[PDB]
Amino acid sequence: ADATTLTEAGYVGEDVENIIQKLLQKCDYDVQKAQRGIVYIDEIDKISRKSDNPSITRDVSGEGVQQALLKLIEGTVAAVPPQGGRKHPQQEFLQVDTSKILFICGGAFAGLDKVISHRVETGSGIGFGATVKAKSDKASE
Amino acid sequence: ALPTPHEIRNHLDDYVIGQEQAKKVLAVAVYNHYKRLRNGDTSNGVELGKSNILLIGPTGSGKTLLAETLARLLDVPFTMADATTLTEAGYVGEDVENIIQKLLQKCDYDVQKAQRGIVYIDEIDKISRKSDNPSITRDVSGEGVQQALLKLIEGTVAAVPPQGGRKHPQQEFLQVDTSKILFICGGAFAGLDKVISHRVETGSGIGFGATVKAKSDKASEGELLAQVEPEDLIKFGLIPEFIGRLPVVATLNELSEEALIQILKEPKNALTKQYQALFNLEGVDLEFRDEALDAIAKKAMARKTGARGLRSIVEAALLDTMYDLPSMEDVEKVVIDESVIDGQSEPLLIYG
Amino acid sequence: ALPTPHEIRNHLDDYVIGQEQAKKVLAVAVYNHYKRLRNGDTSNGVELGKSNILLIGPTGSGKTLLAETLARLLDVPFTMADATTLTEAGYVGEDVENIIQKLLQKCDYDVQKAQRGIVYIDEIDKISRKSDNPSITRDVSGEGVQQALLKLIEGTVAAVPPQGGRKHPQQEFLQVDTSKILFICGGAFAGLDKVISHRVETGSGIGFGATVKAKSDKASEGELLAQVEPEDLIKFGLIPEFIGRLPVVATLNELSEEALIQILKEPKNALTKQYQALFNLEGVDLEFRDEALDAIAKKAMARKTGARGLRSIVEAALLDTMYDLPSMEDVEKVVIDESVIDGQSEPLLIYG
Amino acid sequence: ADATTLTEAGYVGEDVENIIQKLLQKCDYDVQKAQRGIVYIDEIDKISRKSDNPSITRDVSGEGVQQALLKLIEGTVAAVPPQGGRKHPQQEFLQVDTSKILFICGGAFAGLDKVISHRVETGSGIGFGATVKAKSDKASE
Amino acid sequence: ADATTLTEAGYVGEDVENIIQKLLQKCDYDVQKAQRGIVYIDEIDKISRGEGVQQALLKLIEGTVAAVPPQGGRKHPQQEFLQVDTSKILFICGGAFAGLDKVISHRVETGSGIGFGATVKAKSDKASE
Numbered sequence A, D: 001a002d003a004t005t006l007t008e009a010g011y012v013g014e015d016v017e018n019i020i021q022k023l024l025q026k027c028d029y030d031v032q033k034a035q036r037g038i039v040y041i042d043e044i045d046k047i048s049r050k051s052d053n054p055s056i057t058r059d060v061s062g063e064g065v066q067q068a069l070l071k072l073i074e075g076t077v078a079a080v081p082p083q084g085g086r087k088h089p090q091q092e093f094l095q096v097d098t099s100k101i102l103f104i105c106g107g108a109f110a111g112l113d114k115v116i117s118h119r120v121e122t123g124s125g126i127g128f129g130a131t132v133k134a135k136s137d138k139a140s141e
Numbered sequence B, C: 001a002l003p004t005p006h007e008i009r010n011h012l013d014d015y016v017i018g019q020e021q022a023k024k025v026l027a028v029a030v031y032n033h034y035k036r037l038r039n040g041d042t043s044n045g046v047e048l049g050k051s052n053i054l055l056i057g058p059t060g061s062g063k064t065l066l067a068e069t070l071a072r073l074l075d076v077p078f079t080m081a082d083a084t085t086l087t088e089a090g091y092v093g094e095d096v097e098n099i100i101q102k103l104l105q106k107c108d109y110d111v112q113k114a115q116r117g118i119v120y121i122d123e124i125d126k127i128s129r130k131s132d133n134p135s136i137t138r139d140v141s142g143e144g145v146q147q148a149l150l151k152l153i154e155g156t157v158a159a160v161p162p163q164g165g166r167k168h169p170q171q172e173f174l175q176v177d178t179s180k181i182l183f184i185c186g187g188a189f190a191g192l193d194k195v196i197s198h199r200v201e202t203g204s205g206i207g208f209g210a211t212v213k214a215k216s217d218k219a220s221e222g223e224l225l226a227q228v229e230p231e232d233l234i235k236f237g238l239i240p241e242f243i244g245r246l247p248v249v250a251t252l253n254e255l256s257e258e259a260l261i262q263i264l265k266e267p268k269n270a271l272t273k274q275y276q277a278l279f280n281l282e283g284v285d286l287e288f289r290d291e292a293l294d295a296i297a298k299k300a301m302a303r304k305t306g307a308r309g310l311r312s313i314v315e316a317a318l319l320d321t322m323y324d325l326p327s328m329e330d331v332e333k334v335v336i337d338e339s340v341i342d343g344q345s346e347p348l349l350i351y352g
Numbered sequence E: 001a002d003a004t005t006l007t008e009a010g011y012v013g014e015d016v017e018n019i020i021q022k023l024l025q026k027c028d029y030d031v032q033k034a035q036r037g038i039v040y041i042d043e044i045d046k047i048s049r050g051e052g053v054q055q056a057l058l059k060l061i062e063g064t065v066a067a068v069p070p071q072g073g074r075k076h077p078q079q080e081f082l083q084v085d086t087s088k089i090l091f092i093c094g095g096a097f098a099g100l101d102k103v104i105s106h107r108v109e110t111g112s113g114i115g116f117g118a119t120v121k122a123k124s125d126k127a128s129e
Ligand SMILES: Nc1ncnc2c1ncn2[C@@H]1O[C@H](COP(=O)(O)OP(=O)(O)OP(O)(O)=S)[C@@H](O)[C@H]1O
Pocket: B150, B241, C015, C016, C017, C018, C019, C057, C058, C059, C060, C061, C062, C063, C064, C065, C066, C187, C188, C263, C267, C307, C308
């Protein structure tokens, strides 16, 4: 899955809970196999929290999406309708625990180098005995 | 029968001490407000006007406490807010219509009864302009908030979203009228005394021919605030159109060491009674000697913490006993004195 | 038959005292507007066009009061708006088209009635450029509001929800043309006198050849406002395109002591009449001596808050009285005189 | 139409494509007639990107409207509501090309004279070699 | 929660109530259980100097009623919104005041830090701290 597509529940974008349902589709909706499955949330950095914008009605993507994903890591059974259940509820709600499901989040955190450097960069001195750092060997990601 | 000012003042006296003048203004205003609501039919041609209150007093003088002590008896919906949070419309901070939203929560989102409610606005001092501002920056936290409140206080229909929503082209709005909704803006106008001190004793000239007959006198900040006039607020930074919406002004004097001692035992919800009841349920009586109360007040004044600091002082003094009292046995009563405050002697424990 | 301007002024002067010039413009505009509605056929080759009004005046001068009094006799729907709430399109603040929605609510969402309705936009001075013509950052709450209103005042096909957004699907936004909708903007332009003074005054210099002007012989606020011109408003912050939509400008002078005295008793809903009825239900009569009213007018002028200052003076005088009045027995009448205004004396209490 | 109400797509304010919607109403939602329609975008001078503004901010009210209108003036297919009823279930996007529609934009540019004067005069200064006119001999607006 | 997250100063009301909403998730969205919950904060020294941020924070500690949606959902009306009083919730505002130790030494110990007689024993032991 990709965090970019994911949005807060009840919105036009997507719902985070369908990730468990997508995993079940691979193993034909069996909880035993699903529990041992692995999840890969690509582009995790794209859902980084952002400040509120007056023009935008609400920030559906951001910390709100991170809370739904965090709930699965804490460990919670997720209700999934099997065999593509009809709109009628019928109380199927297959419970799949998320404590044993491996969660992997892989994203390219562009710009993180800037904040990290500000914290671990000693700086360049000015005196004769100081250490001068040229831009060539300054640092790298 | 509508409660008379004496009855309302008695309730305020139980929880608030040293603000006799403030209680009268709020008590009569609440009584007059009920009369206006009671006279809501208004068979006579005359239309009863609305007068708002402006509580100006130092921090820790019980300005907020007066508002909280009214919700207990107040029949109409009452709520509290903060002016600092409010901001001009069209900005990311906030909007002034949220004040009605908070009031709507208490009234079960019923606009009919909400129109007869009372509102309180805290920290209004932060909204004042500092000085000589060209306004090119388009100040939002300050002057912008005042301009929006003008119509609100005098009375205008306001579009309030249902809940947890921001203004947008959507039709999720509730038309609420603030004509009959009272407003009590309370803030600590720090520095206003200097403005009043200037006008009263500005003097004229410095040289030999000058008139320096006026002599600066040492007066308490509360005493000086009584001489405040609208002209002083204009210099502080408040728009003249805003004061007109608040005709009634009441000032609260600063608390004294003697008053702090009274606050420890006289109030119905006194701090001392809270710890006593905490121990009474366990089965061990608690008593505080007057020797400790005097020392407790001195510590607060010494540290300038005020009435709020009283909680911290009591916590430290009883920290040792509270930790050991539940585990300990055969403790019928505990006696505290001034020796406990300084820490030289542990609180006396009585054994049964 | 349509009411003549004199008849309209008769109703307006009942509640407004001293605003002779304002009443004439409003009465003539209202009378002319009715003629245009009666001329809906428009058989004449020329098509009649509306002229807008701009009511300038200090605080407590009767700007907002005139709008409320006019609605009492307006056959067409009338609504009041707040410029502060309005913001540029695409922002959290309310849009300018919402004003048309409020008018529609009054006439049962009837586009025909709304098209011939009257609109009032209070606090129009708030939406003004803050003396920064470039406007580095978009002033959505300021200059942006004016731009949105530029085409609305002259006429635009506004889009609004059909009936308070019953269901968002199939909106079918109603089309309303504001070409024939009269607009009456009003606000207190604080600081405009400084602009007009610079242009009219000769100026001042420091050298031998310059002309020195004494502080005593200087133009007053009322005097400068009478000489207001469109060029002056442009410097204040308004856009030139905006004034063009408001050809008629009617300024309001500051209320004098004589006018303030009349306001206390002459209008239908005065301060004295308000408190008089307030006490009548309680069973005690209220009598205000003529000398006392004159003293209140002088004290109010010092407050610089306009007519609203009178309410503060009366409340302070009767603050203690109202606090103890209900508990008292058989108080048949109360008398207030000049001795009570300054505070040296206490109001007299007559016992039956 | 007025450019003031228009804003960049994806925001609460009305989109630029709504202009075509207004044109369609005049011809009773006739796509053929709409292609031959004429438009008058008044207040075009108000939608102007502020050259002096914070760099990291999106001027949806300004430049955003200009950018979106680029394809609308040159010619492009724009999706609009189906009809006055605004049927939501039915797709009925009524694709209309804007390649044969004339757009007569108009606005009163305030302050443009001050910009033109900078290029035309080229003589402002304080020294002997500068040109001083006293505003009496300066060119008019 | 962290003070740096809430230093935005824009619509602070929605984030302060968002904290209890996060707490409500753990307690099965039970108002009574949420009131008994313990909330923690850290890095309070950073906001001390935004002054405005402190104005909003004190209200949460003093006690305030915050409306929250009922266990998420697609949408819900103002009536269904759950309101939890924060007066019964325990708030712990943690922090690390590195520079405060110097202020205390100035007030309690000698007010000399540069001269010959001053104490500049910055050995990094920090035992006296
Ligand atoms: N000419 C007047 N005649 C009678 N009462 C008046 C008059 N002017 C003011 N008042 C009283 O003062 C109150 C406030 O007057 P307003 O017209 O609302 O002042 P204002 O022009 O709105 O000032 P702004 O708009 O806040 S700057 C009215 O409700 C009346 O009670």
